[PDB]
Design a binder for this molecule. Structure first.
Ligand SMILES: *[C@@H]1O[C@H](CO)[C@@H](O[C@@H]2O[C@H](CO)[C@@H](O[C@@H]3O[C@H](CO[C@H]4O[C@H](CO)[C@@H](O)[C@H](O)[C@@H]4O)[C@@H](O)[C@H](O[C@H]4O[C@H](CO)[C@@H](O)[C@H](O)[C@@H]4O)[C@@H]3O)[C@H](O)[C@H]2NC(C)=O)[C@H](O)[C@H]1NC(C)=O
Ligand SMILES: *[C@@H]1O[C@H](CO)[C@@H](O[C@@H]2O[C@H](CO)[C@@H](O)[C@H](O)[C@H]2NC(C)=O)[C@H](O)[C@H]1NC(C)=O
Lengths: 57, 161, 54
C-alpha cells in the first residue's frame, strides 16, 4: 500500500503518538524476523537445489 | 491534484469599520508593518454586527482560514474595536462555530500580550458558509480551491533543496 | 436514583441552547437554567448558553 509519513499528533496527545510509535515497532519486528528467516531458509534450499541437479546428472 | 488561491470576500462591502489592518510583528521583506495576505483584520466594529454569506459554486472544495482576536484588557479591546463586545459565529454547511469575546493577558511574544488564534474549515462544492461578527475577527478574505487525492503522503522535514 | 438492577443502565439526556433572551424567556421564564448531572463520582455541569445558530 501507499506509504505515508503523516504520523504527527498534537501536543496533548502524546499517548496517541506512542501508539503510533509502537505500531511501527510491531511491523518492524514482524518484517525483520520474517525477512531474516526467509533468506536463511531459501539459501539452504537453493544450495540443496544445486546439489539435486548435480546428483541428477 | 489542484490548488488555487482565490478571493472569496469583498471586504469593501462592510461599512463603518476598518479593513486590511496590519502590525509590525509581520513585516514585509523590507521591514515595517504588514499582515497575512489571505487573512483580513477588521477593527473598530464598535459593537455593530456584520453579516456575510457565500456559496461554493466551484467544482472543488474550498479551504478557508480565519482568526479570532483575544485582547489583553478592556483598554486594548476599546482601542481596537471601540466596544467591550465582539463575537463571531461562522457556519460551514451544518456545523456552527462560535467564538465569544475573550479578554485576558498572555505573556508578551513579538511585542504582543494579546493573541490571534487561527482556525480553518472546508466548504464542499455547492455547500455554503456564513459569518456573523460584532468584532475581534480576522476574515478569510482569500481561500484555496483544492482537489483531494486518495494516497496521503505527509511532510518531509529537511533543509535541502 | 440508584441502579438496584443486576445490569448497567444507559441514560441519554439533552441540554437546550437557546437563541436569544426572548426565546429563553418564552421557554423557561428566566434568564437562567443550568443542569448538573452526577453519575457515580463524575460530575457533568452544563451552564446556560444563549447564542444564535443557523
Ligand atoms: C496509490 O497507491 C497505490 C499503491 O502504490 C497505487 O496502486 C497501484 O497502481 C499500479 C498502477 O495503477 C498497480 O499496478 C498495476 O497492476 C495491474 C494488475 O496487476 C495484476 O494483474 C496482472 C495481470 O493483469 C499481473 O501481471 C500482476 O502481477 C498483478 O497480479 C497491472 O495490470 C498493471 O500493469 C501495468 O504495468 C505493466 C508493467 O509493469 C505494463 O506492462 C502494463 O501494460 C500496465 O501498464 C500494473 O502492474 C498496482 O497493483 C497498484 N497497487 C495497489 C496496492 O493499489 C495507486 O495507483 C496510487 N494512486 C495514484 C494516483 O498514484
Ligand atoms: C446556499 O445559498 C443559496 C443562496 O442564498 C441558497 O439558494 C437560494 O435560496 C433562495 C430561497 O431562500 C432562492 O430564492 C434562490 O434562488 C436560491 N439560490 C440558488 C442559487 O439556488 C441555498 O439554499 C443555500 N444552501 C443551503 C443549504 O442553505
Amino acid at each position: 500500500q501507499f506509504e505515508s509519513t503523516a504520523k504527527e499528533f498534537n501536543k496533548i496527545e502524546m499517548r496517541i503518538k506512542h501508539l503510533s510509535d509502537r505500531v511501527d515497532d510491531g511491523f518492524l519486528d514482524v518484517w525483520s524476523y520474517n525477512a531474516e528467516l526467509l533468506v536463511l531458509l531459501e539459501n539452504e534450499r537453493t544450495l540443496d537445489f544445486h546439489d539435486a541437479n548435480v546428483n541428477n546428472l | 491534484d489542484h490548488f488555487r488561491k482565490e478571493k472569496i470576500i469583498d471586504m469593501t462591502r462592510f461599512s463603518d469599520v476598518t479593513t486590511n489592518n496590519v502590525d509590525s510583528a509581520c513585516p514585509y521583506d523590507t521591514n515595517g508593518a504588514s499582515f497575512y495576505r489571505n487573512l483580513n483584520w477588521v477593527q473598530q466594529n464598535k459593537g455593530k454586527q456584520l453579516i456575510f454569506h457565500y456559496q461554493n459554486s466551484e467544482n472543488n472544495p474550498l479551504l478557508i482560514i480565519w482568526g479570532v482576536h483575544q485582547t489583553s484588557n478592556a483598554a486594548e479591546q476599546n482601542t481596537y474595536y471601540g466596544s467591550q463586545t465582539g463575537s463571531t459565529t461562522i457556519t460551514i454547511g451544518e456545523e456552527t462555530n462560535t467564538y465569544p469575546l475573550v479578554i485576558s493577558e498572555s505573556s508578551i511574544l513579538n511585542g504582543h500580550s494579546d493573541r490571534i488564534n487561527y482556525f480553518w474549515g472546508v466548504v464542499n462544492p455547492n455547500q455554503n458558509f456564513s459569518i456573523v461578527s460584532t468584532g475581534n475577527f480576522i476574515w478569510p478574505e482569500y481561500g484555496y480551491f483544492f482537489q483531494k487525492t486518495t494516497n496521503i503522503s505527509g511532510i518531509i522535514k529537511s533543509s535541502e533543496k
